[PDB]
Each structure stands twice: as structure tokens, then as C-alpha cells.
Structure 1
Amino acid sequence: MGSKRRFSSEHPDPVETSIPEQAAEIAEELSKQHPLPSEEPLVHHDAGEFKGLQRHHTSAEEAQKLEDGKINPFTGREFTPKYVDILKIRRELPVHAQRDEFLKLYQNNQIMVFVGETGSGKTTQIPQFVLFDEMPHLENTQVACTQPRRVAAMSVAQRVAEEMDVKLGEEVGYSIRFENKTSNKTILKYMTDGMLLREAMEDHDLSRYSCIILDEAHERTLATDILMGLLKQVVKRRPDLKIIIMSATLDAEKFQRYFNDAPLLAVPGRTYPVELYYTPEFQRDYLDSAIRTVLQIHATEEAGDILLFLTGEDEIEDAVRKISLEGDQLVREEGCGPLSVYPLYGSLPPHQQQRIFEPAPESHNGRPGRKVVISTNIAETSLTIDGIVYVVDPGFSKQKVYNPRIRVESLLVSPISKASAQQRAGRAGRTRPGKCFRLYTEEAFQKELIEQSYPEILRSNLSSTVLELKKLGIDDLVHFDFMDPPAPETMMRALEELNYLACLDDEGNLTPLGRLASQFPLDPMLAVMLIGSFEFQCSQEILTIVAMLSVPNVFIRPTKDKKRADDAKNIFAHPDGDHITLLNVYHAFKSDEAYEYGIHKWCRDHYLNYRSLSAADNIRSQLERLMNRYNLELNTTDYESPKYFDNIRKALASGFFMQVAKKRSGAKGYITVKDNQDVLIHPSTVLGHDAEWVIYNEFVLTSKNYIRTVTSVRPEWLIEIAPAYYDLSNFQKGDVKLSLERIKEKVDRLNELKQ
């Protein structure tokens, strides 16, 4: 890197030998032939209803006047009765008592920090307060409000659209990856932090916004950490941009310092007392204990809804059916009030999200009707369900973990932090004195649980982050002003990986491939695989595989019904090719037979998750549009062609050649090309005899090291496709890999001369 790296046939240029790079160059030239247009202009309504209001000199009183008026200032329409009822209710939120104090701070500072307990009205009200003082629409801009969580962004936008008496997708909208609900009319845009990051990649100054509100900063996601850095600089280049940092942690010092001694507004807490119940003994099996305590609460405690925290969608759906079924049994057998039960988790469709806010069912019984929401930690600080009085806290969540010594992420179910435990308990005290049932000991809470979780950036593989920073035009990656810097070595490794992928050249600059990959909301390996696929004559099939990989395991395997579940899977299963299996299932899911059969019944009878398949369907559609937009041809070859499956395996390889494992000759296990790790094929797939080399999607770390979602690949293909990576010079000494790598190359040379 110091002097220009030299390349040669023995140590080749990864960019020059990248098949996907070749595709990107073809696509780039096509685009350069018909340069795509610019963003459609924003549009707004102005009939003088804002006359008399002066930007940045607004008051709560003036705003209230408009809100109290008969006609909606942002539109031309009469305010509805629904609106007025919602209006008087939300005016009770703690944030309203400080509206004027907030405006003052907003008016006199470019950056401010805003802290308050969840439920106090931060996400719903504040951005509305800003619309009145900022009148962004009259100056041709919007205001962004960023959420770490998709569900918070979607549901809160739906609510705020109601609070503003406008249509969702119009004046108030949301933007999520693969799911956009905005238009030329949108003024207030709730969105994931990931999506604003992506907007910034296209427009470094985020010129479309006059105010950016980074919310739930206390979660310290990668995306908000990056946005905080970026915005700390953008703010020097645009005096017209205002920035609000919102957080639930009444801790602000560190944030204020980071943002050049920015001022702080704190909302006093209004939470009612919450009585804490602990288990006397350690609880080995929390699910059934959680279920038991929900039913006990419902049968014995007075009115008040229940919030149960679980860990993931499968577990949650399982608990929904068990609690639902036992609830019904309690009505008929003991005369309990009705008990409604709702799931909440990351992938829920919007309609279903909205169900959690439904009133508890009325009892015609004399015993209280009651709602149970069974939620992931979305319900920890990201949103509130009015009427919760009881929380059940098993003490676990799904957390990203990184391993520097093995260089790999993995999502594990792990004990929560004490701060998280505190937040969960707090949800019980929003409306009245509540109770929180912790499925662990008081000792464990006081001495075992870690105080605070580490920021995501310190628990992350940074290959996506590096490509993003590069796209943002950041050259000095080491000195990017992170609030908590990652270890330099994780960054270096990411740069190297991106170079091998040919997204960056050896001097750290974007290639045509890197530039194009940055246009897809996908991990670099996936985007590269997709980009190159038309060069392998199978972009239609790679399209579906990438969509299928962007979604949870689709196959349902009940513990008590394994045999039939497996029978069903084998209908689609491809030997030595889990990746092909995904293609089969999706193709069948889209079949006329399936549709004729009744799609939902079809998935159920086939042990398939309709929710995941439908999400894959939408993702495929959105990806196709990107491919049309950037001129990546949609390719396929005849299924009857001896090269069909070959092409697919090769395209997979072009992206995943660094996630390859070779069959251990002596130990009858597997060894990974990168880092030389001993691993076993995950139990969920059966290896065939001719599968000496496999490409794997995932590294799973239970008690042993497993490799999951594998497809066989010919070694000569790896060498042919990624010569720079499969150069024995950088290969450590012997075990089986280098050794049999040499053998492969020998065999390959030996074949040339004869002819």
C-alpha cells in the first residue's frame, strides 16, 4: 500500500480477475448511455394558513392556535373529529409541558440533545413541534426522524399520520429497506437509521432535509453511530440544517461533549412505582415459566394488560398459540375473562403490528378481559402500548456478538443488561402502579447481569460499514470521528476483504463494482454475487437465491413433527446444494399449483413459513427494480442444460469464495479456507460423497463450530474465479488445504499441455 502494489500471474489483481467487476463495467456503460433522471421535486400546500408564523420565532401558543383551528394548515382540508379527540389526548403527554422550552433550544442551537423516558412523547410529538416552528414544506424540505427499529418506524408513522390528520404515505410517511411509503407530498419522514444512511450515500449533505432527528440514540446502533459522525461534519457545511439527538437514557454528558457541548433538554420522569417479583431459584427453562406466569397474572390480578418479552419470532409464535389455547381453556373451565394475545417482532407486516394497540376484549363474565402482547425487545424503549400494567421478563434477547480471534459475527440468545432489565420493568408503570415478574434471582439481577451492552460498532464485522464510508467519500477510515472507535484491525480486515471482492482497489478506492454494490441494500458478498450473475447466465436464479438469503429459514420443523416436516422439505431439497433448495422452494411458492391450492394452506401443509416467503417475494421485486435501474440484465439458461447447476454454483462462488470449507481427509470433518477453522456441516444438511469442497452461508457457534447452508463447489472453479484469493503464497502451512490446493493446480496444469 505504501508503494503501489505490483501484480502478476502469480499474484494477480483481484479487480482485474473479478467476473462481477466485468458485469459492473458493462452495466455502467449502459447507464452512461441513458443517464437516469433526478429525484422528483417535493410538493406542498400553501394557502396562507401559516402567514403570521415566523420560522424559528414560533411559540407553543401560536402552534396550538393552528392545531385548534378548523382547517389543517399542512393540507387544505377540514380537521376531522378523530383528529380533535386524538389532539386533546396527546396534549397530555409530558413533552407538551416543555414545548416552549424545547422551541427555545431548537431556535438557538444547531445541535441539541433531548432526553426522556419512553412513553413521554419524544418520537410522536417532537417532530410535530418542529414542523410548526420550521415549516419545512414552505422551504422545499422535509424532516427526518430515524429509528433503529423497522417496527417503530412503521407503526409510529402510522400513528403520527393520524395525529396530523393526513394520509399515510402522503404528508407523513416512512422509509424502510425494501419497503417505502413516501411520496412527493411527504414532509415528515420516519425511517430506519440504515435508510437515512443510504440516502446520505447518494447525497452527502442530505440537502433534502432541514431538520434531522436521530432517535433512540441510546441503542447506539452502527447506523446511528455513523450518522452522528457524518452529521457532525455536514453541520459545518450547512448552517440551514438542524440536528436533534433523542435518547431514553437520562445520561447525556457523553453525547453533549461529542456534539461540541450541545445543550440538553430533559423531560422529568412520570413513571409509577413498579413492584418487582423475582424467582427464588435459577430458572433452567424460561418459556414454560413465562407462559405459566402470564396465565397466573390473568387469573389472579386486577385489570391491566400484560407485556411478555421473548427473543424471536418462532419462539413468539409458539407462545402465542400456547397462551391463546390455554387462555381459551381458562374461560371455559374457570370462568376467566377473555384473553387476547398478539405477537410483536421485527418482520411483522404493518397491519399485524397495528393489532397490538387494540383495546382488551370486554368481559361478559364479571372477571377482567385482558390483552397480552408477546414482544421482542422492540417494546423495551422503541414504542409503548397504552394499558400495560404487568411485565414478564425472562431476561434474554437476541444479541449480535463478534469474535475478533475467529473473525465472525453470530446472533446469539443471551442474558440482557441490567439497564435493559430496568427498561423492561419501567414499561409496567406508564399508566398506573404496576408489577414486573423477573424469571431470575434478585442476586442475578444485582451481580450477574452486565451493566450496559456494548455499542454495535464494537461487536461488528465492518465490511458493509467500510463500503458505506467509502461511498460517503471518507478516505481516512481510521480517523473517522466515531463516538466509540472500532479496533483498527477489524477495519483493516474489512478493507482487505472488500479488495478481494474487487469493491475497492488496492489503494482503497471504489471500483465500478464497489460503486454499483453500494446501490444495493445488501451485504457486499451478496451484492457482488448478484451483480456478477448475468455473466454466469443465471441472474434470474441468483436473484431469487439472494432474496431467499435475505430472509429467515423458511422451513418449519416442529420438534414433535420432525419426520413429516423433513418429508416436506425433501420435496424441494437439492443434494449437495442448500442454495439450490432455496431456489426450488421459492419457485414452487410462486407456482400456479400453489396459488390454485390456496397459498396460505399450501405453505402450512408444506411446512413453510408464508411470512418469510412473502418477504422474499417483495425483496426479489425490489431487487429486480434495482437491476433494471442499473442495467443488470436478467439472465437464465435452459434447465435441461448440463451447465444449469454449474452456472449457479459459480455465481455463488464469485461472491462467497472467502466462505469455503474443504472436507477433512483424515478427521472426516471440514476445514475453512479463511483462518483455517475446523468445523462441522450443520446437522440441518446431509453431505454427499463427491462434496469435497463447499461454499457456506453462515458460521454458527453453539458449543461446536458449525457451517450452515452449504453448496458443493469444484475447487478449480474457486481458483478460476478468485485467483488473487486462491494464491498459495498467502496460504498457511499444509493441514489439508494448501496441500490439496497445490494438488489441484498441478492437476490443472497437467491438463493443458496434452492437447
Structure 2
Amino acid sequence: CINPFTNLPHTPRYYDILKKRLQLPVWEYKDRFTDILVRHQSFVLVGETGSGKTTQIPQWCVEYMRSLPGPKRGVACTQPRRVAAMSVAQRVADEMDVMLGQEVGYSIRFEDCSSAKTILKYMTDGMLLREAMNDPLLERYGVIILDEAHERTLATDILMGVLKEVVRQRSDLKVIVMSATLDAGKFQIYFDNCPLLTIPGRTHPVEIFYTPEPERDYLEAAIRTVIQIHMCEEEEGDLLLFLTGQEEIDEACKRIKREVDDLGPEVGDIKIIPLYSTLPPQQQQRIFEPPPPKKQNGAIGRKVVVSTNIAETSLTIDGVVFVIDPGFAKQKVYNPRIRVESLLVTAISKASAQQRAGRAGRTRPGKCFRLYTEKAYKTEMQDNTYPEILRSNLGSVVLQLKKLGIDDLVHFDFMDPPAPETLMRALELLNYLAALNDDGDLTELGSMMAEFPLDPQLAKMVIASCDYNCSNEVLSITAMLSVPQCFVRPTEAKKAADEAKMRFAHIDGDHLTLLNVYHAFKQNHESVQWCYDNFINYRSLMSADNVRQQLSRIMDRFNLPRRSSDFTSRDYYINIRKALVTGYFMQVAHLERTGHYLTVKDNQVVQLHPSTVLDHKPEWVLYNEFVLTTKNYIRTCTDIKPEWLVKIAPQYYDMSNFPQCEAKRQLDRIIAKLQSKEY
């Protein structure tokens, strides 16, 4: 029959895919799905990964929208994960026989693939909350679906609160909450005891393996699980290994590419595939590829995917029988008393481990090779990881809620309410940035900050830089800070990489070094060869350029001038460094007489991250990032003048409320000197 959007026949592609997708677990419940949808404003849908929730259900809601009178609106389906949203959009575009970016599309922070024609949009949970800023009832959508709500991300929880208020003012909107599990909060009690639909699992049983006692270096000891699986096992099937991020991942794909062809033609081939947050579409889509063929003589031609907890629940790779679970992941941590946010590798929950093992069972029965003991699972691990709202600084969150018109914050319906101390640190942060007044009301400046898709600190820095006549350079720095690490540092060629990085070093430090990289990238015409020559990440730089363009359009909308100072003047670099202070004045460390650094209020001993270009230890350093390892590192570091701290951020540098230390004694000396009294 006929494609309703194109008014043409559906294609050969379309029919081949329709055939396979009708067989997905979700389809036998479509009638009862439809029957709940037409009768209720909101309900919950639970089903294991691979059951067909993300691809099929939003199509059904499109079908539903096309049944309706003429207020002709979209469907939104939120993903916690960029790679999930972008790759399902491509998949669903194919399933619906449409062009990605036309009837089906996606929206990620700085990456909008959509048009006038878009009626189904796969977006991050973060982006839908962004859209609510300018459209508080989300009138562009008739159906909104929060997918992967079991991952309890910060943006997902806030969307559940928001949408629960939206449904009281809008009768025409439908909300669906989809999840892999019934745990991670109860959802239907939250949405006023609304219907539940559960899709049975087709998990081919999975043999859970362990190790005798605690493993120390799991990277190489999970490589030795990857190898022994790719010889000892006799039937076909692909491998999925859970690492914690995109260096450790790339390590294990550089490693295990010369090895394990340590071995001639004899053993079976391996198509090795990495998966992490950053990858562009054209290379996300290689997890969906057929493994290499069987050799005439030898072993199974096999596929190994090396991946973040993106593959835990957010998608399925067909072919996977063998799952290796190191049992850690890059979480977000936040002490509300230390006031330090950082990304930390840490032990997963029983919920999570069991999810990861689940992936091995999605074709035939499989084996999960968990690299722990039963004691490090049964007795030593949590049932459920804390929902992300209890592990984050809520500065951005609070600003977004205030921009959405939410005044009283304890009188706000969180599913799991945050510790009221973390809430109050967020209010203070925002008051220090002048985003909120002393009553906690949104200022004109706060309102504007909220429409930049940036941490409040960065937003304030961009806006305030106009008054230091260096908005152009601050926008470039901001864009470099908003994309992945730009310096390629192969572990086999550290001195070479470091020396290339030094070609760009500014004497006052790393922020200006990022400005130097960006300027050099542009004046060399976005050249890939230039990037290779200088060990600069071409993808990072292309991403930065795109972020800068996006941020530029926001500046134009708000009439904030995009200006530079005179490069021949000394004020050029001074002005930019003063601008950094307007946003980062709380991220400041003082050089002690001992050669250590102590963070300004919280008195934490830190050292300059070893990747810094700084030649010397500035007396005062402003930093972008606090890195928790076995040492505290401050990363992306600039030399600043303490006088700037007093002049630009007096509310924070209030000596009546400040701990005794070398920093306070210099600061008091500076404050007395400004006042030039002889009492």
C-alpha cells in the first residue's frame, strides 16, 4: 500500500523491514496499547531491552496523531543518550520510509536534525526541558514519551515533574513513560496511579560467571576474557564488553588490534567496534554490521563491541551471546558539603549488573563473565544506584525550573526529592552569579542565562564578556570547553603529542591555549592534515566550530554584541582572563608556600593537572574542572590576579565570611590597600 507522508508507494526497503519488526515482542500488545492510549492521558510501558519499545511505540503514537481532527502535532520520545536518539531516528526513518530530518528526526544539544515536516522527534531529555523554556506546555507535541526512565537521569526526573504539572493545564496531551524495569521508582504511583502495560521478556537464560577473589587491573583481565571467549567457545556469536569511557575504550581497541593477530591466519577474525557518547552518526552505525565471514578452515568470524553503558539498556546489538562485566561506570558524584562535582569510575548496582547480563540472552542462551566475586554482588553492591538527582549539583536544574516559573522549590513534586542542602547550594551558586536575587527570584540576567544550553558559570561568562569587550574570544573558549578534549595524546607517543600541544601554549595557561587552537584551526581552513600535523582532534574542532555558530545565534537573538579588543594591546589577553573570572570565580586555587594549591573556600589540596601547559605555578589559578583520582587535580588552568577576584566577584570574596589561610591574608592586604586609609 501507500506511504501517507510521501503519497508514494512504500519502497522495497520498507517491506523487508516491516516483515522483521512485526515479530518484535511489543507488536502482540498493540491492541491493548492502543486501548489504554485512547482512554487515558498518561500511562506506563515496561519491557526489557530489545522488546521493540523505542522503534515501534512512537510510530504507533504517530498513527494515533494522524487519527486526530487537525491540530496536527508531533510526537516526542526522549532518550537519556545522544547515540541512542541519533541512531534510532535513522532506524525509524528507514522503518517509516522517510528521510532522516524530514518526517522523522532528532534533537541533541547543538545538533538539530529536523524540519517543518518533522512529526516524530527523538531527542535527549535535556533538549525537551530546553524546549519547555520557550513553550511551557510543550504545545508542539500531542504525545510525549520519556524513554529509558529506569536510568533516572537528572533531566528525565525533572521532565516527569514538569509533565505532571503540564497535564493539569492540558487535556489534549498524552504522556507515556517507558522503562526496562519496574524498579528505579514506581512511576504509576507518581502519575496518580495510571495504567501499566508490561511486555514479557524473551531473554534466553544467561550463565553468570565470576572470579575467585577481587580483580585489580580489570582492563587487561577483561582483555583475557575477550581472548579466551574468542578461542575456547565453539558456536558463533558476538562479544560485548563494558568499559567506563572513551580513552580506556580506545586503549582496548588499539590494544587488541596488533594483538590478537599475535597469531597468523589460524584463529577466527574479529571486527572490533567502539561505542561511546561522542561518535558521529556515520560511525555510530557500525555496531549494526554483519561480523566478518568464517575462514575456510578456522574459527568463527566474530564481532567484538567495546562500549560504555550505552549498550546496557539504550540499544541492542543482534548477535551478542557473550557479555563481559568489569562492573564499573563513569558516574557523576557531588558532595553537597565539599561542593565539588566530578566524573568518577565506581561500582554498578545489582539492577545494572543484571541488565548487562541480559544482553547476552537476546539471541540464544549466553554467558556473562562478571569480573567480581559473589560477595562483591550479593553483599557488597547496591540493589539500585541512586537516582542521578541525588548525585548532582543542581545549579543548572534550579535555573531551568526558575525559568519555567517555579518559585517555591520544596513545594515541587520531585519523584525523589533532592537533599535540601544540595538545593540550597544551587540557590547560592545562582545568587553568586546574579542569576537569582536574595529572595531566590530570577533576574533579567538569570532569565537570559537560562536560554544558553550551558552550565550557569559558562553562561554568565559569555554574557558578561560583552562588557570586557572580548565576547568573540570567550565564545570561542566556551565552544572549546563544550566539546571533547582537543589534544590527541597516543600513549605510545606522549612526548610528541605534548610538544605539538606546546606549539599552541599561552603563557597564562590553558583557556587561552584553547583560544589559540581554535584560531589556528580556522585560519588553516579546517584542514584534516593540519589537525594530524599538530595532534589536534579534527572532530573536536569541527564540533567546537558548530557549538560556536549555535551560541552566536543566541547572542544575536538577545542583542549581545560579538566583539574583540585590539590584538596589539596588552588588554586583549587581560580582558579575556578577567572575563573568565565572571563565571569561574568559585573555581580558584591559591599557591601555598609549600608548592601545593589549596582551593579558595573549601580548602582542598590540589595539584595542576599534568596536561597543563603552564610552565610555572601561578600564585592564583582559575580552573575549569576538578578531577578526582588518587590525587585531586585541577584541569584547564589559567593564571589570574587576586585583585580581580575582589573587584569582579566581591559577593563571593567577602572577607567577613572567609576561612583563615595564606589566600585570606593576601586578600586582606589587597582590600586594605584599595581603601588607602591610615587609621
TM superposition score category, shorter chain reference: over 0.9
Pair 1:645-2:573 in alignment: yes
**Equivalent-residue separation in structure 1 for 2:194 and 2:184 (angstroms):** 10
**Equivalent-residue separation in structure 2 for 1:361 and 1:629 (angstroms):** 51
**Equivalent-residue separation in structure 1 for 2:357 and 2:18 (angstroms):** 29
**Equivalent-residue separation in structure 2 for 1:136 and 1:717 (angstroms):** 62
Q: Report SS of the residue matched to 2:221.
A: helix
Pair 1:359-2:290 in alignment: yes
* Pairwise CA distance, 1:531: 1.0
Match of 1:740 among 663, 666, 669: 666
Aligned CA distance change for structure 1 residues 143 and 177 (closer, same or farther; 3 Å): same
Match of 1:72 in 2: 3
Match of 1:227 in 2: 159
* Pairwise CA distance, 1:690: 7.8
Match of 1:711 among 635, 638, 663: 638
Match of 1:625 in 2: 553
**Equivalent-residue separation in structure 1 for 2:52 and 2:21 (angstroms):** 8
Structure 1 stretch 339-348 or stretch 555-564: which is displaced more? 555-564
* Pairwise CA distance, 1:364: 4.0
CA contact (8 A) 1:545 1:580 kept: yes
Q: What amino acid maps onto 1:704 in structure 2?
A: K
Q: What amino acid maps onto 2:528 in structure 1?
A: H
User: What TM-score results when the alignment is normalised by the length of structure 1?
Assistant: 0.87
Give the share of equivalent positions with the same residue, in percent: 64
Match of 1:532 in 2: 464
Pair 1:616-2:548 in alignment: no
Match of 2:583 in 1: 655
Q: How does 1:69-468 map to 2 (within 5 A)?
A: 70-135=1-66, 138-251=70-183, 254-301=186-233, 302-330=235-263, 333-366=264-297, 367-468=299-400
Match of 2:443 among 511, 521, 529: 511
Aligned CA distance change for structure 1 residues 560 and 324 (closer, same or farther; 3 Å): closer
Gaps of 5+ in 2: none
* Pairwise CA distance, 1:508: 1.7
CA contact (8 A) 1:115 1:252 kept: no
* Pairwise CA distance, 1:294: 1.7
Structure 1 stretch 279-288 or stretch 532-541: which is displaced more? 279-288
Choose 1 or 2 for highest CA Rg.
1
Higher relative contact order, chain-length normalized (CA < 8 Å, sep 6+)? 1
Q: What amino acid maps onto 1:682 in structure 2?
A: H
Q: Report SS of the residue matched to 2:187.
A: helix
Match of 1:683 in 2: 610
CA contact (8 A) 2:623 2:636 kept: yes
**1:344-401 deviations in whole A, cap 9, x for unaligned?**
1101001100111011122342432111111100000000111111111111111111
**Equivalent-residue separation in structure 2 for 1:514 and 1:720 (angstroms):** 21
Q: Report SS of the residue matched to 2:466.
A: helix
Q: Report SS of the residue matched to 2:203.
A: coil
**1:475-530 deviations in whole A, cap 9, x for unaligned?**
01122100010111111121111111111112222222111111110000001101
Gaps of 5+ in 1: 1-69
Match of 1:591 in 2: 523
Structure 1 stretch 494-503 or stretch 162-171: which is displaced more? 494-503
User: What TM-score results when the alignment is normalised by the length of structure 2?
Assistant: 0.96
Q: Report SS of the residue matched to 1:320.
A: helix
Aligned CA distance change for structure 1 residues 467 and 511 (closer, same or farther; 3 Å): same
* Pairwise CA distance, 1:447: 2.2
**Equivalent-residue separation in structure 2 for 1:86 and 1:718 (angstroms):** 61
CA contact (8 A) 2:509 2:614 kept: no
CA contact (8 A) 2:591 2:617 kept: no
Q: Which has the higher helix share?
A: 1
**1:73-111 deviations in whole A, cap 9, x for unaligned?**
233121001101100100000000111011111111111
Count of matched residue positions in the alignment of Structure 1 and Structure 2: 675
Q: How does 1:564-575 map to 2 (within 5 A)?
A: 564-575=496-507
CA contact (8 A) 1:569 1:607 kept: yes
* Pairwise CA distance, 1:283: 1.8
* Pairwise CA distance, 1:255: 1.4
Match of 1:494 in 2: 426
CA contact (8 A) 2:137 2:166 kept: yes
**1:44-83 deviations in whole A, cap 9, x for unaligned?**
xxxxxxxxxxxxxxxxxxxxxxxxxx21123312100110
* Pairwise CA distance, 1:662: 1.9
Match of 1:14 in 2: none
**Equivalent-residue separation in structure 2 for 1:306 and 1:376 (angstroms):** 13
CA contact (8 A) 2:42 2:174 kept: yes
Q: Report SS of the residue matched to 2:256.
A: helix
CA contact (8 A) 1:336 1:365 kept: no
